């Protein structure tokens, strides 16, 4: 029952900038994936205490959720869009790995990842 503290969202030493890619990801991709009706399990970090999953964090070594991504985008933690895309794919990969294929949460993650990949090809070049 570790339930490790959620990933850090703000870093005062880290520089703050609002590139075109990051503000697009925050104002388009994250808003769309947040107002979706399959997004509630990823709005919050996996509370392994409630769900009684003592093996989630022992298998998932790099946890991630869309709420952490939101709090990182709002604090300008990201320097480039590669970090945000890596975090999104890390969340999707953790959800795929821990569960068995064909489960409900797996299909919801597949839906969200398909929408994310069809919304990420619309990536405008930096200003």
């Amino acid at each position: 029952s570790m339930n490790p503290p959620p990933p850090e969202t703000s870093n005062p030493n880290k520089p703050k900038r609002q590139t075109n890619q990051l503000q697009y990801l925050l104002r388009v991709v994250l808003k769309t994936l947040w107002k979706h009706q399959f997004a509630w399990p990823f709005q919050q970090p996996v509370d392994a205490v409630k769900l009684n999953l003592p093996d989630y964090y022992k298998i998932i070594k790099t946890p991630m959720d869309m709420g952490t991504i939101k709090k990182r985008l709002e604090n300008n933690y990201y320097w480039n869009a590669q970090e945000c895309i890596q975090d999104f794919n890390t969340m999707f990969t953790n959800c795929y790995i821990y569960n068995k294929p064909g489960d409900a949460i797996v299909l919801m993650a597949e839906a969200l990842e398909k929408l994310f990949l069809q919304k990420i090809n619309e990536l405008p070049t930096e200003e």
Partner: protein, 375 residues
């Protein structure tokens, strides 16, 4: 208590299921005692009652393929009433005819939202799991055993001209003394056959239902005794075992009798897991949907909960902030409700968004978590 200005048609519309669906006006009704082979949905663990509107949200490719198959044929699927659902043990059930469907694109995966209605009770004869995984069921339809007037056998040939009738309890005493007169020819009196008459029990249940639903009995309640009994059973907050025992009843007279007996006895609703924590009372039950105070609803997860709307609810803790996302009652926000002792999920406290609305706050409890109790 308070007054209401919500306009209740929206609960029945299930506006949370996207936009306007593709409505079907046809009706497929099979004959009595006719054994049909019907597919069974996998993720439906509900004891459906005829007439009860059932919403569904399915996204499994297996589920969507079966739905596309059924839309092309007769739009009828079986809903098993499981005695022990941990092993899919079914003996009774109720058919459900689809009347609205909507597949949604610009969406991650292929998903279909459906509104169906219960049709015909049935007994389960054979449950066969295909190589696909989806299961079929060979199934005998159960007939509606409506019995004739209990005095038509005794009836005097000369009194046949007095069997048509052109301060309510005076009228009911007149009705009793005029209809069941020939009871003096039997070993039992008139007030005993009044307990087994259809209209007397219907009026008693109407008196009991005027407490909850403020809609007049002129149009909202059905006229047929069988339809009336089914409409009453659709909104009876009882556990699964008693709902099974109620669906077993074929004769509508015994259905109405057991319904009024339950309404007389069960006064308090406690938590099912606690068994010793009063959640609410029958007096606080008020109707917010046209279907009644308790109606079935579906969430984005895909689960179907039988929500009963009450004015007050005791012994409950509140979890989470209010949220209007996929709210079953438009204009209100829900908040998770746990039991005060076992923390089991009991329902949701629905609070109004606009301040002009009424009621400003009510409760919607799921039927699966409640248990009726007599003091």
């Amino acid at each position: 208590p308070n007054i209401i200005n919500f306009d209740t048609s929206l609960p029945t519309s299930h506006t949370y299921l996207g936009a306007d669906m593709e409505e079907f006006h046809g009706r497929t009704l099979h004959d009595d005692d006719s054994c049909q082979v019907i597919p069974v949905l996998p993720q439906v663990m509900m004891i459906l009652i005829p007439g009860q509107t059932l919403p569904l949200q399915l996204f499994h490719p297996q589920e969507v393929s079966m739905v596309r198959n059924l839309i092309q044929k007769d739009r009828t699927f079986a809903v098993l009433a499981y005695s022990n659902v941990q092993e899919r043990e079914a003996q009774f059930g109720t058919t459900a005819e689809i009347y609205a469907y909507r597949e949604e694109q610009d969406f991650g995966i292929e998903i279909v939202k459906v509104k169906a209605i219960g049709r015909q009770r049935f007994k389960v004869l054979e449950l066969r799991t295909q190589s696909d995984g989806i299961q079929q069921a060979k199934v005998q339809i159960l007939p509606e055993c409506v019995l004739p007037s209990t005095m038509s056998a005794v009836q005097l040939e000369s009194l046949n001209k007095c069997q048509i009738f052109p301060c309510s309890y005076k009228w009911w005493q007149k009705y009793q003394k005029r209809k069941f007169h020939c009871a003096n020819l039997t070993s039992w009196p008139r007030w005993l056959y009044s307990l087994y008459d259809a209209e007397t029990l219907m009026d008693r249940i109407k008196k009991q239902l005027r407490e909850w639903d403020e809609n007049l009995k002129d149009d909202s309640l059905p006229s047929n005794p069988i339809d009336f009994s089914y409409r009453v059973a659709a909104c009876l907050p009882i556990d699964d075992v008693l709902r099974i025992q109620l669906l077993k009843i074929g004769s509508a007279i015994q259905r109405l009798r057991c319904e009024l007996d339950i309404m007389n006895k069960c006064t308090s609703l406690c938590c099912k897991q606690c068994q010793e924590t009063e959640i609410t009372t029958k007096n606080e039950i008020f109707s917010l949907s046209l279907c009644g105070p308790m109606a079935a609803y579906v969430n984005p997860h895909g689960y179907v909960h039988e929500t009963l709307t009450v004015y007050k609810a005791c012994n409950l803790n509140l979890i989470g902030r209010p949220s209007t996302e996929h709210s079953w009652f438009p204009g209100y926000a829900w908040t998770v409700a746990q039991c005060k002792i076992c923390a089991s999920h009991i329902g949701w406290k629905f609070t109004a968004t606009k301040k002009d609305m009424s009621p400003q706050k009510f409760w919607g409890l799921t039927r699966s978590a409640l248990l009726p109790t007599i003091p």
